[PDB]
């Protein structure tokens, strides 16, 4: 190892009296260096001193073996050993500082003038052998708990003295550094309990379902292909199909795939001597519950696209030539208002253009959409002309990155062309349901996906799934680019935000 | 020693896989004082305040017989001493007493759940993974277990609830009997506990009587001197009746044992079925004199419709009710005069009325107009006609917050009633409903002004007669605010009103009471 | 045979508590301090308390928490370490006369005691020392460290053994009274023999236990927090209502901004919006504004009453707007617009919902197009100090009124004059604010930790060194003064403020008058 101004720290010699058991580990784990997650960095000549290369906290998450073994235990104590590996030839200059931050330290930005005060080591970029460091366990309690995120001593590495090298015309230069770790000879678990599957250290996975069979979240119709292009606005404001990875729903996205673009309301029918009878709908949640205004722009499943739409609402007739019928009503959701539709307050109006006043009975009807007229990709009038709370627009994106859109086609009334519409969304419905049900634990920033074919095994492209619930690609073209609907998404690992993908 | 030993007792085999744990040898140099417990406490086993359980053939595998959290709440000596100190460490010894008959069969498991384990199901498949001990319901000698203390801090705090090692016992194999005749035995098991050799408190604090542990106690007064919680009259009888509906929705005399009040139960005893309002009078050549009431609470506060169905003390029955009111008259000679007004409950028209909306109508027959003035009055009941013990409408036809119906009950359990039937010749009622309630007003006041802390689910009470000093029965008091007892009869059963209720111990919901 | 004396000195018996002997095998380092701190008593940051005959038995005079915040040397040294273990000692002095009679108690409440209420019959059960008001010599007490964790953390307040004193016997004077005699009392503290920090750390300057300071700026060269004009007066007046509900110039001492207060001094009373214009048939040019934040960020309704910087006073406002025109002869013009904010109800005003309507009488027609513009106030008509129509006619979340002044206490006001449009009277209106600009600033730029309830200030001249008055600054961000007159009183503006210490809620100021 290396000399560091710190005292030896006791491990299991302190927690033995106050713990029921002390459990050993397989001895073949103390002899292997396994890469820690998020333990990679790349230094480039354009970087400036003071950039935080990486930081990570001591725990059972620094080793897949320990992270898996910590499901049937309760606590853990002890120190670990860490190895830093740098790639660089003998025509390089620069220096990097590696420190040992104490646990209870304020969270903020560290300038290069402050990082050196901690017990630290200084490493050149020309170093040949890997650099070894200890990672003790400084605490105030006898042992930690495996199901709680406590405070533990961290490791922070930041660039100290910048890099000076020449560069060819193709790949300028990148000094790559990687981190490995292993438990020391003083690591022990505490109490044996029956295994728990839904633990905190669970890698995120995705359902094995091809995109051709998914269900769109903005309109009840199957997905008919996915694509990416820069023509459309970079930051839309869709209120359906938004979800966090951790399992919290934003906007007005419903849990099931049948509530989309449909609403439940109590109806009141009153004949009007002009166009026809007029129905006023007081909205109510689909499951059946009082609707009160809040942070949601509308009741769950309400449409989030502007245009002219019609629905079927299971009419009833008290006249004697029949008892129950279904006929098409009329709805207006486009811009320019000219109506008194207040979904936020729970009040909608509908009408049918027909004479010979009908006989109707109010029957707390449902509603299912049929088709649209004049689709516009803007939000509708949630209030009269006021502002209502809503989800933030999708963004921001790294330069040269573009959103991936799942696309479907609508039914049209236009008398000019019948090509497409075509409605886009960020995620299909089953992904939303999966993320809502499982409720994973987000680790750092984002996931690295891979859209590989099932049979041949060749890889199509690499995409990044941000924590906010959208997928971005490193595309630098000019025209629309579609993709096949056969491959299966996979999860690679967590990556930092400032990660550069492979261009497609 | 004992008689024929065709039984098991060989407990011996504990062999629990756990290391010894240091007690007060750790917290000694981090506490400001020195303390010790009376050495005669460490010597004799005594019953825990939650040391009663019963195994019955109606149970199924997977039912949690009992659970215990390590602390001062497992010993009356330590429970009493916990009000004078702050913090505790150490282990305990627990004796479990099962003495089932020689005709029974079954097996139970005792586990040692570690701290921080999530609370919830704990099915039968998981209980054996912890360090566990097998037991038979036919063992003779008491079974001894150690209850150690596993922690990470030096000492816990007596106030609030920390996380410490638990003891959970669940029925593994169902209990059945081979007795040839007519019945299946129910095994009653007891618990005892004493501090280990290294128990100690930490810091001295003023003795505050209102402690988190404490122990629920009942007022020592006979039910015959109580006052009813639904009508201004004394309690006249104690009744059990299976014929009448067993899940009412009464809105008075309902109060949690931890202090919270539900429904429209007033704290005082004179607020029942009485209401204060602002009243405006007028004359109609039909009904006579009609008066509009806007109600407010009796103290003098304003009314705002909240999570309560009606102002506190409002009646919660149906029928025609006649009240006595005080009015001031303009004409000479008579200036103050008492009158008898009357109103019905359900007239349903565009006159609901809506006590939820603070609006009420009253009418009195009078051919000649009475010169009356606007005023503020208080109304107290005088007579009833056509009384139905069903919840009346409060709003127009909408839904209003309401207390949940009294329940649920175990099979064979019946709800006790503080009730009076006095036989009488009725005029218009074919279903004679007489006066009833669930608890008297004294109990409501006691529970509201004491604010106890519940422990598991319910209390075990015994109704002991005071003249001769023999028990009459035992009942289960659910901490939701009602009393139940086992009864499988057909007709009503009445009880004397000379006993005084006692409190024995806490108990879970699935306790099987003795028949009566 | 024995002898039991009837006069024994007061003492508190203690059992030694291990300090670094426990945290050594689980802390990275154990750092000692200068060995000449253990030999001197220093005033604590919270070291002021006062006893008055207005008090009643059973009142909590003061309470302190064991930690590095009880000594200026330790408060300074704590900026470069992480943990600490050990005990201290606290000395108490009272400035009592030979006429006042009374007794107080000092008790060492242990940690995790339910922080409810204490009666006079309970405080005496803890290890306690009984003090008389008439004592001359200071009295000292120890303060052990009773804990369950190995070593505390500086950045977390946590729970530690307290020291709370309370009035035992009511204070009474042989004089007829009621008088204004108050007994002052001060505290000092010093580390015991077993104190040391834990981990070494680069010295940060923005941390807890950092003494609050104020900018050295005379009020003449400051800026009003409710109008773009310099401060023109400093005054106190009891005729006006003593519980205003201004929505501007409100900031906590810690840095939490309350209401619609903007950080900069140039955002006040002015806003920015996307504006659409439309002509009429006699009304004139009617312009509809959708409000946005001054920096261009979108506005979303929330718990804030209105967009930042919106005016919160009733009346008719004349504003200046930059527009671009269509007809030839000119391109860009500046136009005067009218705005209605008071409870007129003859309009559709909802700054909460981000809709604003403005009008001008006419010039000729003046066809102008939509544009993103910024509105700055120019003139005011019909001033009434009442909250305007934030919603149409409904309610809106608002900052609470000031409160809760003790009896005999009033609020200090900073007075700034207006630009008035009037026909009858030539008097100039004035606006009172609780704090000026550069005082809402210098807050939310520093993470000050309150650590107590009230902060005691002091006003004095620069070149004369003469005290003018003492004022109490509450946590919520207003200045309280002890005045008992009838008419308004103004003060010279050339003085400067300076912090003194932290004082509890029940501190009694010194009466001022003329
Ligand atoms: C008459 C309709 C059923 C047929 C219909 O109109 N649509 C069915 C379809 O097309 O899927 C009735 C059947 C059950 C009714 C629902 C259920 O009773 C539950 C619920 C009850 C609330 O009071 C009103 C909404 C809500 C949600 C009701 C809306 C109307 C429903 C859906
Ligand atoms: C002068 C009247 C007495 C009227 C009276 O004799 N009423 C008898 C009756 O209600 O029948 C006084 C006696 C008690 C007073 C009330 C109590 O003293 C206090 C109460 C609460 C507030 O302090 C003020 C209102 C309110 C509600 C008081 C209103 C005026 C009352 C009602
Ligand atoms: C209010 C000011 C115009 C100022 C002016 O000419 N007269 C008003 C005054 O003097 O205050 C508006 C007009 C144009 C606006 C800009 C543009 O409309 C848009 C532009 C977008 C950038 O991303 C950031 C803001 C930025 C840069 C805007 C800042 C505010 C500006 C500069």
Author numbering:
A (entry chain C): 27 to 530
B (entry chain B): 15 to 530
C (entry chain A): 19 to 532
The authors write:
The T=3 icosahedral calicivirus capsid is composed of 180 copies of VP1 with a molecular weight of ~58 kDa, which is divided into the N-terminus (N), the shell (S) and the C-terminal protruding (P) domain (1–5). The S domain forms a shell around the viral RNA genome, while the P domains form protrusions emanating from the shell comprising A/B and C/C dimers. The P domain is further subdivided into P1 and P2 subdomains, with the latter containing the binding sites for cellular receptors and neutralizing antibodies. At conditions found in the gut (i.e., low pH with high metal ion and bile salt concentrations), the P domain rotates and drops onto the shell with intra P domain changes that enhance receptor interactions while blocking antibody binding.
Once the sequence of the purified mutant virus had been verified to contain the V339I mutation, the structures of V339I apo, V339I + 2 mM CaCl2, and V339I + 10 mM GCDCA were determined from that same sample. The calculated resolutions for all three cryo-EM reconstructions were ~2.7Å. Panel A shows an overlay of V339I apo (blue and green) onto V339I+GCDCA (red and orange). The positions of the P domains are essentially identical and are in the activated state, resting on the shell surface. The overall RMSD of the alignment between these two structures is ~0.4Å, well within the margin of error at this resolution. The only apparent differences between the two structures are in the outermost loops that are more than likely due to inherent flexibility. The correlation coefficients are calculated during real space refinement in PHENIX and represent the agreement between the refined model and real space density. These outermost loops become more ordered with the addition of GCDCA or Ca2+ (the color shifts from reds/yellows to blues/greens), which is likely due to the stabilized positions of the G’H’/C’D’ loops (insets in Fig. 5A through C). The addition of activators (i.e., GCDCA or CaCl2+) decreased the mobility of this P2 domain as per the improved CC. Therefore, while the V339I mutation alone is sufficient to push the P domain nearly into the fully activated conformation, the addition of these activators finishes the activation process and stabilizes these key loops.
